[PDB]
Amino acid sequence: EHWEEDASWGPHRLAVLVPFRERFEELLVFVPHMRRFLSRKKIRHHIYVLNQVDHFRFNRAALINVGFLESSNSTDYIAMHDVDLLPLNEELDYGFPEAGPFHVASPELHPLYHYKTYVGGILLLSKQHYRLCNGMSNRFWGWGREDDEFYRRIKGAGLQLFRPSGITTGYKTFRHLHDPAWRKRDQKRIAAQKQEQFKVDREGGLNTVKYHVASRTALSVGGAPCTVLNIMLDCDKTATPWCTFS
Ligand SMILES: O=c1ccn([C@@H]2O[C@H](COP(=O)(O)OP(=O)(O)O)[C@@H](O)[C@H]2O)c(=O)[nH]1
Ligand SMILES: [Mn+2]
Numbered sequence: 530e531h532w533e534e535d536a537s538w539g540p541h542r543l544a545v546l547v548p549f550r551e552r553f554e555e556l557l558v559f560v561p562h563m564r565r566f567l568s569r570k571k572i573r574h575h576i577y578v579l580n581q582v583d584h585f586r587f588n589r590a591a592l593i594n595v596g597f598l599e600s601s602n603s604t605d606y607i608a609m610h611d612v613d614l615l616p617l618n619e620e621l622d623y624g625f626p627e628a629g630p631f632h633v634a635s636p637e638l639h640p641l642y643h644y645k646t647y648v649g650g651i652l653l654l655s656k657q658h659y660r661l662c663n664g665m666s667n668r669f670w671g672w673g674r675e676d677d678e679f680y681r682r683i684k685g686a687g688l689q690l691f692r693p694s695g696i697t698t699g700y701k702t703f704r705h706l707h708d709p710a711w712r713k714r715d716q717k718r719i720a721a722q723k724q725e726q727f728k729v730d731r732e733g734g735l736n737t738v739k740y741h742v743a744s745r746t747a748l749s750v751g752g753a754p755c756t757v758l759n760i761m762l763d764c765d766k767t768a769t770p771w772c773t774f775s
Contacts, residue, residue: 531601533564533754534573541625543567543653544604545576546596547612548589549757555613555706557750562615564753572623575601576755578612582743583761585772586715590665590675594738595760597656597664608633608653613712615704616651621693623653629689630654638693638702648683648690649676650703661686664735670764670772672714674726682734715775722771739763 532542545563549556560576567574577600579592593609600607606625614634616623621633634650636643642650654662662682669675683690696702718726743759764772 532573532575533568535571538571538573539624540573541605542573542575542601542603543623543625544596544600544607545574546593546600546607546609547576547578548581548587548592548609549578549612550581550587552612552712558706559612559615560748560750560755561753563610566616566619567623570619570623575604576753578748578755578757580757580759581762582759583764585762585764586670586775587672588667588670588675588762588772590669590679591667591738591740591762592760594664594667594735595740595742595762596758597659597735598738599742599758604656606653606655607659608651610651611649613705613707614650615706616702617704618696618698618702620696621702622691626653626655626658626691629691630658630683631691633693634703635692635696638696638699640700640703640705646677646680648680652676652679658686658688660735661688662734664738666730667733667738668725668730668769670769671719671722671775672716677727678730681729717775719771719774722769725769725771739765 577596579596631653632648636647665679740762746757748755748757
């Protein structure tokens with residue numbers, strides 16, 4: 530039922546954790562694309578659409594944290610997966626990342642971001658490895674720096690980061706359906722946000738995330754099923770005032 534799976538597939542169940550708010554066109558293409566892609570690669574999976582329905586700025590990392598907590602307690606691993614980044618090459622390892630976190634959307638392959646420590650887009654971890662990092666920071670509202678920070682959590686935890694090798698498709702490895710004019714990145718740094726972005730967050734993450742699920746809805750998109758989680762993220766306006774206005 531819950532898991533798309535056949536008896537012959539390897540046992541590891543992947544939760545696809547998709548940070549989401551107002552990307553409907555993209556969602557329509559993404560869900561069946563990922564059902565097809567994962568099924569051909571024989572990966573047991575379920576797709577969680579993590580829909581931010583509070584009115585705070587978009588918090589990718591906090592949503593991933595929520596999806597981690599709210600996914601089936603029998604998932605073995607997670608892929609934080611942008612909704613607009615579609616894998617076109619089946620050589621990409623979406624299998625269980627046993628030796629360490631696996632960064633699918635490598636800077637060698639990503640259309641826009643090419644620096645060594647970029648871990649955005651699509652990144653896979655075993656549940657144990659994600660907990661070892663205490664998940665992602667909750668302090669990043671708006672576009673930017675939540676991934677750079679998580680990189681530091683991975684490194685600090687002594688986890689080795691893996692990337693695809695021998696991929697030949699280069700910058701055509703993914704379809705990045707993202708018009709920068711229609712989908713404007715919320716990149717404004719509001720006051721003290723421009724400082725805290727690069728800080729060394731020592732306290733919080735997976736164990737301090739403040740939220741509640743408003744609704745949970747089964748959604749099927751052209752045959753391909755998923756679970757939409759309507760997520761209300763709390764904001765301590767004292768700690769992070771840059772959460773509001775947008
Ligand atoms: O308002 C937003 C902001 C981002 N996202 C999600 O977060 C991902 C990363 O955002 P974005 O695509 O803007 O980052 P970039 O293209 O720079 O990698 C998107 O693909 C979406 O899955 C979203 O759903 N709504
Ligand atoms: Mn994008």
